[PDB]
Symmetry: C3
Subunit: 422 residues, 3 copies
């Protein structure tokens, strides 16, 4: 299921076996709260009603390495577009109308957007009936929900994420998912991962008008599902000569998540925009580059003539470890002490100067200098691919050593150039 | 009102029409909570009083591209300076004294700071009266506020932001703003944008002593208001030759917010330190550089002899889009599919290799590779300024291609140098 | 106690006098909540019981400059390893068993991990007794705690930090610390800084099975305590020639926290991974490099032959200030206005072009351009170390000016090279 290959020649490892779930688009729903325009166990409701009035008062005052290659989006542009529609005249009344005999209804907005509208709290109907037994309790439980939505919007300037359980309860989110217009695969994936959906959603406050509070919930559309994904971990590969500062180093800069998508590979350079759940990888295509699938060739052979593998160079031989999915890459240089230990037995391997790797089978921790790393202890097979470390192929006298946005061919050109002068 | 110019020659766009609101300084107020030193409907207050004692117990245990050019400040240095004063002897008693007959009072501290002090909760007076009818309810509502302030300080190590509605209610914040010593313009701007004020404020726990809990609220001073602001969006400008990796690229690195300020331009390289509300731009001068106004000349003519426009160079021709205020810049290179669509009609434009631009009029989404971008759908006019793309002016054989902290003149010097050798 | 030296020659300052508290490892405890499997003042408990059932329902659906040199760890790898054990059969029942006659017990898990288990809420025993007077109140207070833990896990995908006061109360955290297996020094340091401990902890949801909710709390182990620490502040050092863009600049890139640790120095390049409490510095060794102690020699003499001091170079002479522990470094260049003021007296010093420094004694604010900086007003002595600014030692005609990952020797080599050609 989950497997891993370490490449000794380029000091990198590839974890495969994952399945994708990529946010490719947004769904926008309009959540509504109908409000009231009002001015022994009684005095309980007295303050509960002052709380209500203030919440409305408060709401109305309110409504007055390679990541640099990414483009720049506007995350809530679609949601805010729907908000601007809800300010047109009659547009709020059109909604209030549709949600008259039911909580859930689909409405066609004037600019031609079909949206799932949803009345999750009907305070108006509640207040203008009872407040004009358990009815004290239920008012507090619904009022408290109103106060919390109010709290959230007024410390986040009307835009919140993840969408809290007060903005949209589980039972509400689940049925919203079900009433959505998506495939059965998408419905199940969202239903079985609602905490992730919550984290990739936005809650946007739109309007208070005509006794209605309206906010858009902006939900993720996963248009790519169950394609193969793999994570690339890289570490500095340096020479290990004796005289200090006479060493040269080289790191693959294309680390991150890689997912097959529509004939290409989606690449996510900041592997923190992606959230892994078991063997499923939730990513957002806004944080990706679209590369040719040939990019995968860089792991097998970094000198392949089909794709120009990206690297940076330096003279900075510092030690560090990279904790992978199924093991640990260790770059030990200079006088650093680098080890790996079993939980009960102690040190089992001492690393030499160079870049090496150890799997999580039998290993619980790795130490580099004064830094303790615990390794992920998930089941999976690791393969160690022996190979000559490519930094040995370069003459230090003509090596370009501050290249960052570089590649194999750019380094080869700089070398060929400075070598020709000689 | 909001307008936009795209510059085809340098692959950048400028959105203008915004008005500034820059945090230039801090106001520090001392919020107080008077506490009590104490050891049928009755048993309600019993646990409500145990909650109180613990909160106090708990509080006392508690009280035992170009962003790298920015300097480094200490955000709460002014607030903490006031805290250190409140530990001097008599200094707390001086406050307790002033707030004896009113909730709001201005006190002169011994080190010569005139501060707006504010007793927002008087538990002492409440407890040592009633707890020695609705009085169970009001105790819970004030106690709950105490527990929440306690919660916040003890997960944020005594420093919180944005300042929550428990630290300072709307009604309290509003009158605090009104009793403040600032201009009527500043008062209105803060009153009409209290959620933004909250986000730019700090809450700093100072002391528990002599039955008083004291925290400083650190509020923003907007010393620059209603000056013109404009946002600069830039994208990679590359050549589009057929043989891959034979292309050269160039990006303007001075993207961010620009605001006229006191004869100069304040420049905010990380356009996320700035929050836009309609056409108003809230920035913080701590995250800015002060540039000559001549920096604006880089948009009209990037080769102007008055200011040295900053760029970076590469060989990395990857596709990406930049979503602007009123449209979209698209950098399409290689085999990438780049389009723009109308919401109901589908693809309306297919982009060629190069850097191009489309406005948000008639356009709802832009696609680059596997990445869908929604465009901002705000009203405004866009102007497309036709011009020869400057990367065509360079000979690829003598082009410096890993420059990051570069500029037009630095690139010209490197070229002139390597050309002279030839 | 806290002291500071500014080095005029390299435009940097060192704040010393701090004591370390480094997170070197993790302790993992298993917090449990025993649940119930169930289907006048009465109707209070009715909804309180529906809340309970849902929380369980909801939980079960749920359970279906130099920072780039750092390695990459997996912060909760140890905690999650314990979670995977708690899914083995009998493993939950082994715990439920041990916590039968007490809230606190140490259990040996099957894979040989001795963990402090802790039953912080016994709803089962409570529900299956009473709910089959004040007992309405206590149920609400314990139920509310259950709902909040539920809230937190379901917006954070089961992993929370800082560990909230609902996950683990103060009284619980304190005794957990006391029952822990650590030194008396560690116990006192944690007890006296529980808000910091909270911030460096993780709460990981593990399992619902056999009427038990289990989450791991992952607590910090401070294996290095009371070693000397010092912070290095650096600023751009530029020449100040008249013709613009004819100037060369140089910045020490090794700014951050430095702490003596086990014969070496732990270096924290991102001085925000470290939290200072008075004169104590809480760091995490995962965000550090292990350097030779000789790295300290770079402050006294940057040209020392024992360690190769790291720098970057540019032509970008922009003004900025760096607020230190006890003063302010100012880099004033070009036409920028740079001053320092006393709180009541006004401007007291106007800075010249160059890099200069002023202490916090008599000084309250510093101004660079349109940017106001407040200085830290803590007691301590500053020493100004006069010295020739090293950028004057370089010939601008052969100066390498886009070096970022550079050093004194690398710059000297580039110079020696381009000078030999001449
Ligand atoms: O980060 C900096 C930098 C510079 C000055 C002051 N503070 C930081 N630099 C300059 C050169 N650089 C590296 O060698 C490097 C390595 C890993 N991440 C970022 C960088 C980078 C860089 C960043 C973006 C691009 Cl397009 C190109 C290079």
């Amino acid at each position: 299921n989950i497997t891993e290959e370490f490449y000794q020649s380029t000091c990198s490892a590839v974890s495969k076996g994952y399945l994708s779930a990529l946010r490719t688009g947004w769904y926008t729903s309009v959540i509504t709260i109908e409000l009231s325009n009002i001015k022994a166990k009684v005095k309980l409701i007295k303050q509960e009603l002052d709380k209500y009035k203030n919440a409305v008062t408060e709401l109305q005052l309110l409504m007055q390495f390679l990541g640099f290659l990414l483009g720049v989006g506007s995350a809530i542009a679609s949601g805010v577009a729907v908000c601007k529609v809800l300010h047109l005249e009659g547009e709020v009344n059109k909604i209030k109308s549709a949600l008259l005999s039911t909580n859930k209804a689909v409405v066609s907005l004037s600019n031609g957007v079909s949206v799932l509208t949803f009345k999750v709290l009907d305070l108006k109907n509640y207040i203008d009936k009872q407040l004009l037994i358990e009815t004290v309790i239920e008012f507090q439980q619904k009022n408290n929900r109103l106060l919390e939505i109010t709290r959230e919007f007024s410390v986040n300037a009307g835009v919140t994420t993840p969408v809290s359980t007060y903005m949209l309860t589980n039972s509400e989110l689940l049925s919203l998912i079900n009433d959505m217009p998506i495939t059965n695969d998408q419905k199940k994936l969202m239903s079985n991962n609602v905490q992730i959906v919550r984290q990739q959603s936005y809650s946007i406050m739109c309007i208070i008008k005509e006794e209605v509070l309206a906010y858009v919930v902006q939900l993720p559309l996963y248009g790519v599902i169950d394609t193969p994904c793999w994570k690339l971990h890289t570490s500095p590969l340096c020479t290990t000569n004796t005289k200090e500062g006479s060493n040269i180093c080289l790191t693959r800069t294309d680390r991150g998540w890689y997912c097959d998508n529509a004939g290409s590979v989606s690449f996510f350079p900041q592997a923190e925009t992606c959230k892994v759940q078991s063997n499923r990888v939730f990513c957002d295509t806004m944080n990706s580059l679209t590369l040719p699938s040939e990019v995968n060739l860089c792991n097998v052979d970094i000198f392949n003539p089909k794709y120009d593998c990206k690297i940076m160079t330096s003279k900075t031989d510092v030690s560090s470890s990279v904790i992978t999915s199924l093991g640990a890459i260790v770059s030990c240089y200079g006088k650093t002490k680098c080890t790996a230990s079993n939980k009960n037995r102690g040190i089992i391997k001492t690393f030499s100067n160079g870049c090496d790797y150890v799997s999580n089978k039998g290993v619980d921790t790795v130490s580099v200098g004064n830094t303790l790393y615990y390794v992920n202890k998930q089941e999976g097979k690791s393969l160690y691919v022996k190979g000559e470390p490519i930094i040995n192929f370069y003459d230090p006298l003509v090596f370009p050593s501050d290249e960052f946005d570089a590649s194999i061919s750019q380094v080869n050109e700089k070398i060929n150039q400075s070598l020709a002068f000689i």
